[PDB]
Design an enzyme around this catalytic site. Structure first.
Site, short mmCIF file in Angstrom:
data_model
loop_
_atom_site.label_atom_id
_atom_site.label_comp_id
_atom_site.label_asym_id
_atom_site.label_seq_id
_atom_site.Cartn_x
_atom_site.Cartn_y
_atom_site.Cartn_z
N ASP A 1 -6.20 7.12 -4.59
CA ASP A 1 -5.78 5.76 -4.70
C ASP A 1 -5.82 5.39 -6.18
O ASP A 1 -5.98 6.22 -7.07
CB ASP A 1 -6.55 4.83 -3.74
CG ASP A 1 -7.97 4.46 -4.08
OD1 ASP A 1 -8.68 3.75 -3.40
OD2 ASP A 1 -8.39 4.96 -5.18
N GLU B 1 0.78 -1.21 0.00
CA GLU B 1 0.00 0.00 0.00
C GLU B 1 0.81 1.26 0.00
O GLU B 1 0.29 2.30 -0.35
CB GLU B 1 -0.84 0.06 1.30
CG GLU B 1 -1.92 -1.03 1.38
CD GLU B 1 -3.07 -1.00 0.42
OE1 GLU B 1 -3.85 -1.93 0.30
OE2 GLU B 1 -3.16 0.08 -0.28
N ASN C 1 -8.20 -19.10 -10.97
CA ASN C 1 -9.54 -18.47 -10.83
C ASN C 1 -9.44 -17.04 -10.29
O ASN C 1 -10.14 -16.17 -10.72
CB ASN C 1 -10.41 -19.27 -9.84
CG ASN C 1 -11.84 -18.77 -9.80
OD1 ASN C 1 -12.30 -18.04 -8.89
ND2 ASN C 1 -12.60 -19.20 -10.79
N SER D 1 -13.36 -19.26 -5.83
CA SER D 1 -12.00 -19.18 -5.32
C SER D 1 -11.98 -19.59 -3.86
O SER D 1 -11.06 -20.24 -3.45
CB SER D 1 -11.54 -17.73 -5.32
OG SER D 1 -11.09 -17.46 -6.60
N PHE E 1 -8.48 -6.27 3.67
CA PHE E 1 -8.05 -4.91 3.88
C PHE E 1 -8.26 -4.06 2.60
O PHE E 1 -8.73 -2.94 2.60
CB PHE E 1 -6.56 -4.99 4.11
CG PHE E 1 -6.00 -3.63 4.46
CD1 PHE E 1 -5.53 -2.79 3.46
CD2 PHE E 1 -5.82 -3.26 5.79
CE1 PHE E 1 -5.01 -1.54 3.80
CE2 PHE E 1 -5.24 -2.04 6.14
CZ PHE E 1 -4.85 -1.17 5.13
N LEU F 1 -8.74 4.29 3.14
CA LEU F 1 -9.70 5.05 2.35
C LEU F 1 -10.45 6.12 3.18
O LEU F 1 -10.89 5.92 4.31
CB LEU F 1 -10.71 4.14 1.68
CG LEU F 1 -11.81 4.94 0.96
CD1 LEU F 1 -11.25 5.52 -0.32
CD2 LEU F 1 -12.96 4.01 0.62
#
Length: 164
Positions: A20, A11, A132, A117, A104, A32
């Site tokens: 972002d 990040e 996948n 998945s 996250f 965020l």
């Protein structure tokens, strides 16, 4: 390598409000602030989050505080979620960090949507699940990060981040 170091790599750290990848207002380590196009809406959310008048800027310490909260909220979210908990419970420690990384980034609801998945990870079909996961907007949008994550589910080691 631990969850904090891993997310700190994916990040980055930014002490001033920024956009972002998706164009949203963010600060610190992937926190965020708002999906709203208003920088002002953004600064308001920030002061609310920090407890002070920040005027769009925070200290390292504040970034880290938001970071501890976000990882905690992410872990507690997986644990309370009926689709996620069972998968998490079934995984080894490294893989557990990887699911935290996804939650996250994309939120509980978002990860919970990866039905096929999740089923494959649960069954420990690593290679199938990697193939996948790659078939998603997530992967197409942030391919280098997604590949790191995916490789991690794939091998169960930290190699993808040991570079970095």
């Amino acid at each position: 390598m631990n969850i904090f170091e891993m997310l700190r790599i994916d990040e980055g750290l930014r002490l001033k409000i920024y956009k972002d990848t998706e164009g949203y207002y963010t600060i610190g380590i992937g926190h965020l602030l708002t999906k709203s196009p208003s920088l002002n809406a953004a600064k308001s959310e920030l002061d609310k989050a920090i407890g002070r008048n920040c005027n769009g800027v925070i200290t390292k310490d504040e970034a880290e505080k938001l970071f501890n909260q976000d990882v905690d909220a992410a872990v507690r979210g997986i644990l309370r979620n009926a689709k996620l908990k069972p998968v998490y419970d079934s995984l080894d420690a490294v893989r557990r960090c990887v699911l935290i990384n996804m939650v996250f980034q994309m939120g509980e609801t978002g990860v919970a949507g990866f039905t096929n998945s999740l089923r494959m990870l649960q069954q420990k079909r690593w290679d199938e699940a990697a193939v996948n996961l790659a078939k998603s907007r997530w992967y197409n949008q942030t391919p280098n990060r997604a590949k790191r994550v995916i490789t991690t589910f794939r091998t169960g080691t930290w190699d993808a981040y040991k570079n970095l």
